[PDB]
Amino acid sequence: KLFETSPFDPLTIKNNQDVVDKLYATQSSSIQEVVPTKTFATELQFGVTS
Amino acid sequence: DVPFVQAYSKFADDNPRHLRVKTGGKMANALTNVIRSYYSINAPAIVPQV
Amino acid sequence: ELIKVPTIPHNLVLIQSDNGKHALIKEDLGQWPVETGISLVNQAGVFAVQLANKLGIDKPFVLDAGSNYFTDTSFIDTRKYCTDGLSPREIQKALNRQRAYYDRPELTISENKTLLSQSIIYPDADGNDVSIIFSGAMSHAIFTYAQSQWNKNIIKLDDYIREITLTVPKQYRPRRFKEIEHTHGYVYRELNQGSLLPLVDANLKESSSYYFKKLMSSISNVPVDARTLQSATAALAADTGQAVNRAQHVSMLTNRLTTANAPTVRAITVLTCMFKQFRIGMTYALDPNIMDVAAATCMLLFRPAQSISDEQYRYCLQTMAVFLTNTTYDIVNNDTIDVLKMKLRNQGWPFVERYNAVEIDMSVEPLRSPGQVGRYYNPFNIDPLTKKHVEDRLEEFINQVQVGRFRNASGNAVGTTLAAFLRACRDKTSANWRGYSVLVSRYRSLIPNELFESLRNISGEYNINPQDEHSFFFALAQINADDEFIGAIDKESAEYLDEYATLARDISNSLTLVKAAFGPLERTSGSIINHANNLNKVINHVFADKPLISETMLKILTIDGTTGKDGYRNWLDKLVGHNYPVYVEPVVNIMNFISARFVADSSYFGYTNEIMIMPNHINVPVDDRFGFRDSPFCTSLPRTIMGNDVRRISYNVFSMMEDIDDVISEGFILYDAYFNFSYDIMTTDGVTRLKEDILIVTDTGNDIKPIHFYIYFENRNDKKLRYESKMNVSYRLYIKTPACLLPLSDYMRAQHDYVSPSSSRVYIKDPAVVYTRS
Amino acid sequence: VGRYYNPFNIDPLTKKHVEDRLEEFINQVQVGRFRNASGNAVGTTLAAFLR
Numbered sequence: 001k002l003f004e005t006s007p008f009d010p011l012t013i014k015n016n017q018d019v020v021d022k023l024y025a026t027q028s029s030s031i032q033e034v035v036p037t038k039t040f041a042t043e044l045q046f047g048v049t050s
Numbered sequence: 051d052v053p054f055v056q057a058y059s060k061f062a063d064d065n066p067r068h069l070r071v072k073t074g075g076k077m078a079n080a081l082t083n084v085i086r087s088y089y090s091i092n093a094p095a096i097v098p099q100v
Numbered sequence: 101e102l103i104k105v106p107t108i109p110h111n112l113v114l115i116q117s118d119n120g121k122h123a124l125i126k127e128d129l130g131q132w133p134v135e136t137g138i139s140l141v142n143q144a145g146v147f148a149v150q151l152a153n154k155l156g157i158d159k160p161f162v163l164d165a166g167s168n169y170f171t172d173t174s175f176i177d178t179r180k181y182c183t184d185g186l187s188p189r190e191i192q193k194a195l196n197r198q199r200a201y202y203d204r205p206e207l208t209i210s211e212n213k214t215l216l217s218q219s220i221i222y223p224d225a226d227g228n229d230v231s232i233i234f235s236g237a238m239s240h241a242i243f244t245y246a247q248s249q250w251n252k253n254i255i256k257l258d259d260y261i262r263e264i265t266l267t268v269p270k271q272y273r274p275r276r277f278k279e280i281e282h283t284h285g286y287v288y289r290e291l292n293q294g295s296l297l298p299l300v301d302a303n304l305k306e307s308s309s310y311y312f313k314k315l316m317s318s319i320s321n322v323p324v325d326a327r328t329l330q331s332a333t334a335a336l337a338a339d340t341g342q343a344v345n346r347a348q349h350v351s352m353l354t355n356r357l358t359t360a361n362a363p364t365v366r367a368i369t370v371l372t373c374m375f376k377q378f379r380i381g382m383t384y385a386l387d388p389n390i391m392d393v394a395a396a397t398c399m400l401l402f403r404p405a406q407s408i409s410d411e412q413y414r415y416c417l418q419t420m421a422v423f424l425t426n427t428t429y430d431i432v433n434n435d436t437i438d439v440l441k442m443k444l445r446n447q448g449w450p451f452v453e454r455y456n457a458v459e460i461d462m463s464v465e466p467l468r469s470p471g472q473v474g475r476y477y478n479p480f481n482i483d484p485l486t487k488k489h490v491e492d493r494l495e496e497f498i499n500q501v502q503v504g505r506f507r508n509a510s511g512n513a514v515g516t517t518l519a520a521f522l523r524a525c526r527d528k529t530s531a532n533w534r535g536y537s538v539l540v541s542r543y544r545s546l547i548p549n550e551l552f553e554s555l556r557n558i559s560g561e562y563n564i565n566p567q568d569e570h571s572f573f574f575a576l577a578q579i580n581a582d583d584e585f586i587g588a589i590d591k592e593s594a595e596y597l598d599e600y601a602t603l604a605r606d607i608s609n610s611l612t613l614v615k616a617a618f619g620p621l622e623r624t625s626g627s628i629i630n631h632a633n634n635l636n637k638v639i640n641h642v643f644a645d646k647p648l649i650s651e652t653m654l655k656i657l658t659i660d661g662t663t664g665k666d667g668y669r670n671w672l673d674k675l676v677g678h679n680y681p682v683y684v685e686p687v688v689n690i691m692n693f694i695s696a697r698f699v700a701d702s703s704y705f706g707y708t709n710e711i712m713i714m715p716n717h718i719n720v721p722v723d724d725r726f727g728f729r730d731s732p733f734c735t736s737l738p739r740t741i742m743g744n745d746v747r748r749i750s751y752n753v754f755s756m757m758e759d760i761d762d763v764i765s766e767g768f769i770l771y772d773a774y775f776n777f778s779y780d781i782m783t784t785d786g787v788t789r790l791k792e793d794i795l796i797v798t799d800t801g802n803d804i805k806p807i808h809f810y811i812y813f814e815n816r817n818d819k820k821l822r823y824e825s826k827m828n829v830s831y832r833l834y835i836k837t838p839a840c841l842l843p844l845s846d847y848m849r850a851q852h853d854y855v856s857p858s859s860s861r862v863y864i865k866d867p868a869v870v871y872t873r874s
Numbered sequence: 875v876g877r878y879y880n881p882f883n884i885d886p887l888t889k890k891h892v893e894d895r896l897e898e899f900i901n902q903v904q905v906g907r908f909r910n911a912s913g914n915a916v917g918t919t920l921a922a923f924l925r
Binding site: 015016017019020023024032033034036037038039040041042043044045046047048049050 | 149152153158159253263264267268269272273274275276278280281284289290291292293294467590593594597598600601602604605608609685686687688691859860861862863866868870871872874
Binding site for chain 3: 886887889901904905906907910911912914915918921922925
């Protein structure tokens with residue numbers, strides 16, 4: 001078997017966003033270079049609203 | 051262009067338009083005609099009192 | 101986040117007569133009341149926001165109408181038929197009814213196919229989908245302009261990363277983006293940086309006190325190594341012989357030691373080295389002791405010269421002279437710094453000089469400081485390159501103090517006590533400066549460069565007690581960076597970043613409000629009274645409902661005890677006449693566009709500048725395109741009627757006219773006012789008339805009643821309606837034909853193009869490029 | 875027609891006190907020492923009142 005858990009089921013996807021979303025959901029099964037944690041931000045600007 | 055639109059509307063009684071020549075409206079015509087009348091007694095002097 | 105609009109907001113409606121002879125296309129954008137006597141531009145601003153909400157363009161968005169299509173059953177036809185906009189089948193039904201009235205044959209198959217294929221979707225070179233649909237002209241112009249404005253803030257992910265690489269610290273694990281996101285990733289970000297200087301410069305005491313208090317609370321909780329004072333005290337007692345039986349100067353130093361306020365002082369230490377000019381104060385006893393001299397010496401040696409003002413520096417030198425040289429405060433009151441330095445140096449005291457701290461550059465660019473280099477001072481005046489004090493002769497100076505004779509010609513009790521105390525402070529600062537240097541750098545990354553160079557200790561709240569200062573250096577505690585403490589800092593960085601962004605938006609909003617609302621002041625009672633009343637009206641409106649400015653600004657303004665309304669009113673007052681540059685945002689551009697069209701094209705929104713009242717027996721040219729009976733619409737208001745120019749009267753003059761009966765007999769044009777009007781188009785045939793009488797006469801003045809046209813289509817060979825129009829109607833009201841009306845024959849003028857971005861694009865909600873270490 | 879003095883020596887044109895060095899003057903009082911032998915925190919107390 002090529003994969004213990006498939007990265008994504010091709011039939012379920014519909015566009016490019018579902019591939020990205022599914023890959024994030026199944027990333028725990030794979031050997032990840034960097035294990036995700038809380039994200040750190042260095043820049044944030046809020047624009048004026050209507 | 052907002053300050054110019056107000057000034058033109060007051061002077062010409064009409065909004066400026068991109069496809070219509072900016073002539074100053076009826077005030078410009080009246081000002082031109084009275085200038086002709088002042089110079090000579092032989093000028094037409096056709097501007098109505100109203 | 102970004103909103104994906106599924107359908108194009110066309111505003112077209114189809115009106116056709118019952119017999120089908122006449123049909124028209126009308127764009128309905130609503131009716132907006134307009135008031136005369138006040139500025140029209142200001143009113144147009146209020147209506148622009150409401151119009152934007154109606155079209156759905158107020159908030160950032162991208163069109164997603166690419167998938168709204170179907171394919172014909174014919175095998176040749178591979179085109180994609182759009183379903184947005186006015187349906188071509190509706191026009192085909194209207195056109196066929198028109199042909200039935202004229203007895204023409206119905207539309208052929210070839211003509212039907214061309215009409216039914218007018219609305220299509222086709223791809224462009226860049227992968228975007230272009231939709232050609234029937235829609236209103238102003239709806240197309242406003243919607244497409246808003247698209248171009250929001251697209252300015254949508255950039256590729258790799259472009260966003262390149263703009264924020266310089267601000268990424270080294271101690272954070274990089275984020276691994278998916279391969280799709282690197283190729284087709286996009287982020288909606290506004291990258292303009294707004295200055296916080298307008299708030300800081302106007303309110304310096306309030307801004308400084310707020311940020312110092314927040315910083316002090318964080319630094320006060322830093323863990324420190326628990327080292328007992330017994331080892332330090334025992335060494336001091338041995339060096340300067342301490343006897344229970346005798347009274348010595350060393351005891352006065354020892355009994356006054358206390359570590360109760362140690363967390364507070366160590367937070368002050370960080371504050372001095374974190375800001376450019378953070379000046380601290382120090383008040384000694386009326387009769388100085390050996391503790392005050394030790395405390396004063398510690399301040400001059402281990403604190404930056406930038407933190408000690410000249411007046412404090414002179415006060416420190418005066419205290420030493422009173423104790424060491426046996427003089428009074430009144431004598432040294434008039435002596436200068438140079439004179440005081442000579443007095444102490446002659447007696448053998450060398451610690452009379454301030455020392456400048458060495459600046460250390462930050463590794464990364466400070467936040468909200470694009471293209472700038474950060475700096476901070478090394479604690480305890482230790483040169484990082486040499487890993488020792490700036491003064492290279494400190495060892496020699498301490499020995500000189502030891503052999504000196506102060507307060508007594510015979511013996512060295514005072515000198516030995518101070519020398520032993522100063523050796524202990526030197527050793528503790530040498531061992532523990534690295535921990536404080538790391539602590540200072542961590543808190544420096546929280547503040548921008550503007551706050552670094554602007555905030556000052558104006559109030560003087562943070563003043564160090566002499567007992568706390570000398571106990572601080574004698575019992576200096578090593579800084580321990582616990583994992584819990586490290587994570588707490590990371591949470592604060594997120595909250596600091598959000599607070600700065602919120603403040604920048606509030607400053608930009610307040611700067612826009614001041615320019616539009618208030619003018620310049622004059623040395624007159626009328627100007628002052630006018631300004632005071634207008635200022636109160638604006639403040640009442642901004643704080644009503646959901647306040648315009650956030651709670652973060654109100655905390656800064658209320659830090660002195662004043663109310664939120666009062667604090668904002670004072671700050672707005674100082675902003676009048678500001679030269680601060682304000683970056684124009686996409687939403688401001690959108691509103692100015694709709695405001696410009698509201699003024700330029702008034703017939704779309706239900707008001708006009710001129711109306712004409714004319715007797716029925718006078719024949720005037722009218723718009724006959726739509727087939728209306730007794731059409732109240734003219735292509736343009738005639739300049740001449742029957743060879744004479746039409747009289748024009750302003751509304752104010754017509755209101756005061758008492759000879760109105762003579763004027764109406766001839767006919768006139770009313771102008772210098774905004775006339776709100778409404779109309780109803782009925783499919784049947786009838787007498788076209790107005791709902792109410794044209795004018796109302798009162799003893800006070802004349803006025804025009806609200807205008808509402810009942811418009812019917814015309815059947816020429818109807819004697820009953822022709823006679824009623826001429827005999828039952830005496831006066832008629834004419835306005836310029838609204839530009840929203842469009843005959844069915846010109847349905848090709850409703851074709852417009854909308855571009856939707858590619859469907860391969862993926863939008864990233866969190867574009868940050870690093871993770872937390874743990 | 876009449877004329878009156880604006881209260882509290884505030885210029886309406888500048889919207890501030892007439893003395894253009896007031897902020898510098900108050901900071902000078904805050905850091906000053908006045909009665910060292912017989913007084914405590916006179917400068918700080920007076921400065922806080924002035925602000």
